[PDB]
Amino acid sequence: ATCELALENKSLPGTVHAYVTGHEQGTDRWVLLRPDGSVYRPDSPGAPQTPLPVDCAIPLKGAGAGPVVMTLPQMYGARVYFVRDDKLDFYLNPGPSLVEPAFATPTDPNYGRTWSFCEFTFNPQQLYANISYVDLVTALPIGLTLEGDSTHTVAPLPDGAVQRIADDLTAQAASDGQPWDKLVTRGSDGQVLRVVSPQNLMAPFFDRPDQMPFRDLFTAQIDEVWEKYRSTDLRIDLQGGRGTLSGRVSGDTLTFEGGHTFVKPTSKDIFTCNHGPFANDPADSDDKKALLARIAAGFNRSIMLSHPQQPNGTTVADYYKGGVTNHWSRVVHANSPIGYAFPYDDVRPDGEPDVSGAAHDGNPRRFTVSVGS
Ligand SMILES: OC[C@H]1O[C@@H](O[C@@H]2[C@H](O)[C@H](O[C@@H]3[C@H](O)[C@H](O)O[C@H](CO)[C@H]3O)O[C@H](CO)[C@H]2O)[C@@H](O)[C@@H](O)[C@@H]1O
Ligand SMILES: OC[C@H]1O[C@@H](O[C@@H]2[C@H](O)[C@H](O[C@@H]3[C@H](O)[C@H](O)O[C@H](CO)[C@H]3O)O[C@H](CO)[C@H]2O)[C@@H](O)[C@@H](O)[C@@H]1O
């Protein structure tokens, strides 16, 4: 089947362009939605950094004029981009490999531009869209509504959220001297374009860890946590009725019943939720993966010392206390109504509300993606 895609600028003045980029269902061929409603399946270019040969910028009707409504074909790994004023320069690399705007890299053609995107996937099973602040918040927050079986709505960042986030993070940086302010991205004019999560600022330095921003943010805290659980159990409720597993630190290995082992994490690990003890590994049993998720989340939320049993029994009010925490997540959460701010933010105490920015429907009829308010 196909879904109807509605692109809408609710209030921003002037012209906003949307791009819809994805991997075609089955073929895996990068596809872009075109302004005319057709799909542009690029061929592999003759060189890297080959400008997208077709203009796939979809011009949005003016603020309030209603949506651009096209047919959304099924595609995965898909994005709806929005960009204000300008268009976005997409390139092609041999493959074809779409060169997506790199929100976090300053050399990027689009870096100085005001642009955002949300991720979605539309396959025969469901349209699954995701508002997510794991990586960045921008000056062009996206909201969505998915109409199918049910109506699902994800509230955007409110107007001005990215400025608030940038200011809070700069304030944080003033207090702790950590590079939170460097997560902020602004053009020559002064307006905040985006703020990126620490991992996106840290990954350029992954090859040179001794210069990585934030590298020692969590180091002291991690040592305190590892020391705590040398002498007392860490109980992680796997939830879903799977029960808790009790863990202890032996040397630098946090070991849970079931022999699930977690080496001592680094600030990098906590931020990426994907290195050190939080490195994904298909060999990991479900229990290990559940443990992994909850331990990463608990470190990000800085509840490892305060809550030897988690996530059940903790609440959001326990998160992000003290000087050393994932202030990106704290600040994003402060400044956003819904949506995750770090990779294991989906870890939530039972009975706490789902705060994912996800919208999914098994029979999507219209996927309204909007900027403005
Ligand atoms: O948000 C910034 C990050 O975007 C990343 O890209 C994501 C990612 O590629 C994602 O893949 C999903 C799953 O990992 C898996 O491939 O299956 C689902 C179903 O298709 C995928 O959606 O796809 C989204 C687009 O929906 C895409 O944005 C990376 O490029 C990161 O480098 C980047 O920080
Ligand atoms: O949030 C930023 C991060 O985006 C990530 O990718 C997400 C995610 O993987 C998601 O998967 C979907 C569901 O989990 C679902 O069960 O299955 C559907 C397919 O039917 C999946 O779509 O999908 C969203 C949107 O496609 C996707 O962005 C990561 O890839 C990270 O790299 C990134 O930081």
Q: What is the DSSP string of 219-282?
A: HHHHHHHHHHHHHS-EEEE--TT--EEEEEEETTEEEETTTEEEEPP-HHHHHHSSSGGG---T
The reply to whether 209 and 355 lie within a common domain is yes
Q: How far apart are CA 343 and CA 332, in angstroms?
A: 13
Which atom of ligand 2 is least distant from the CA of 128? 22
Q: Locate 299 and state its tokens.
A: 């470190």
Which atom of ligand 1 is least distant from the CA of 119? 26
The reply to whether 264 and 116 lie within a common domain is no
For ligand 1, atom 23, the nearest C-alpha belongs to: 77
The reply to whether 341 and 206 lie within a common domain is yes
Tell me the C-alpha to C-alpha distance, in Å, between residue 10 and each of 16, 105, 285. Answer: 10, 29, 45
**Sign of the C-alpha dihedral computed for residues 292, 294, 295 and 301 taken in this order:** positive
Q: Are 268 and 245 in contact (CB under 8 A)?
A: no
Q: How far apart are CA 253 and CA 240, in angstroms?
A: 26
Q: Locate 162 and state its tokens.
A: 């990215």
Whether omega before 35 lies within 30 degrees of 0, making that bond cis, reads no
The reply to whether 230 and 157 lie within a common domain is no
For ligand 1, atom 6, the nearest C-alpha belongs to: 77
From 76, 79, 200, 346, give the residue whose CB has the most ligand 1 atoms within 8 Å, as the site to mutate.
76
Rg, Å, the chain Cα set: 21
Return the closest-CA partner of residue 348 out of 301, 306, 308.
301
The reply to whether 198 and 280 lie within a common domain is no
The reply to whether 343 and 243 lie within a common domain is no
The reply to whether 209 and 232 lie within a common domain is no
Q: How far apart are CA 174 and CA 104, in angstroms?
A: 22
Last residue of a domain, one of 305, 325, 345: 325
Q: How far apart are CA 189 and CA 85, in angstroms?
A: 14
Q: How far apart are CA 79 and CA 333, in angstroms?
A: 23
Alpha helices in 85-189, H assignment, sequence order? 161-176
351: left (phi over 0), alpha (psi -120 to 50) or beta: left
Question: String of b and e for 283-305 (b: at least 16 CB within 10 Å)?
Answer: eeeebbebbbbbbbbbbbbbbbe
**Ligand 2 center to residue 313 CA distance, Å?**
28
The reply to whether 300 and 160 lie within a common domain is no
The reply to whether 194 and 291 lie within a common domain is no
Q: Locate 276 and state its tokens.
A: 């050190």
Q: Phi, psi (5° rounding) for residue 236?
A: -110, 120
Secondary structure class of 119 (helix, strand, coil): strand
Q: Are 133 and 340 in contact (CB under 8 A)?
A: yes
Q: How many other CB atoms are there within 10 angstroms of residue 62's CB atom? A: 14
Long-range Cβ contact pairs of 30-34 (< 8 A, separation 24 or more): 30/95, 30/96, 30/97, 30/98, 31/73, 31/75, 32/56, 32/90, 32/98, 33/5, 33/58, 33/70, 33/72, 34/58
Q: How far apart are CA 218 and CA 197, in angstroms?
A: 15
What distance lies between CA 252 and its chain's CA centroid? Answer: 30
Q: Judging by DSSP bridges, how do beta strands 114-122 and 127-131 pair with one another?
A: antiparallel
The reply to whether 23 and 102 lie within a common domain is yes
Q: Phi, psi (5° rounding) for residue 247?
A: -130, 155
The reply to whether 81 and 117 lie within a common domain is yes
Torsion of Cα atoms, 262 then 173 then 187 then 99, to 10°: 0
Return the closest-CA partner of residue 40 out of 56, 26, 19, 64.
56
Q: How many other CB atoms are there within 10 angstroms of residue 100's CB atom? A: 17
120 lines ligand 1 (CB under 6 A): yes
What distance lies between CA 203 and its chain's CA centroid? Answer: 15
Q: How many other CB atoms are there within 10 angstroms of residue 91's CB atom? A: 17
Contacts of 6 (CB under 8 A, 6+ apart): 67, 68, 69, 366, 367, 368, 369
Return the closest-CA partner of residue 267 out of 278, 257, 254.
278
Q: How far apart are CA 297 and CA 164, in angstroms?
A: 24
Q: Locate 129 and state its tokens.
A: 């869209």
What residue numbers bound the domain in which 293 lies?
A: 215-325
Q: Are 243 and 294 in contact (CB under 8 A)?
A: no
From 121, 132, 280, 340, give the residue whose CB has the most ligand 1 atoms within 8 Å, as the site to mutate.
121
Q: Judging by DSSP bridges, how do beta strands 366-371 and 50-51 pair with one another?
A: unpaired
The reply to whether 82 and 195 lie within a common domain is yes
Resolution of the solved structure (Å): 2.1
- What DSSP state is assigned to residue 60? P
135 lines ligand 1 (CB under 6 A): yes
Whether omega before 101 lies within 30 degrees of 0, making that bond cis, reads no
How many domains does the chain divide into?
A: 2
Residue type, 362: G
- Residue whose structure tokens are 């991997």: 23
Q: How far apart are CA 40 and CA 176, in angstroms?
A: 48
Tell me the C-alpha to C-alpha distance, in Å, between residue 354 and each of 128, 184, 297, 351. Answer: 16, 28, 15, 9
Pick the ligand that lies closest to the CA of residue 361: 2
Residue type, 39: V
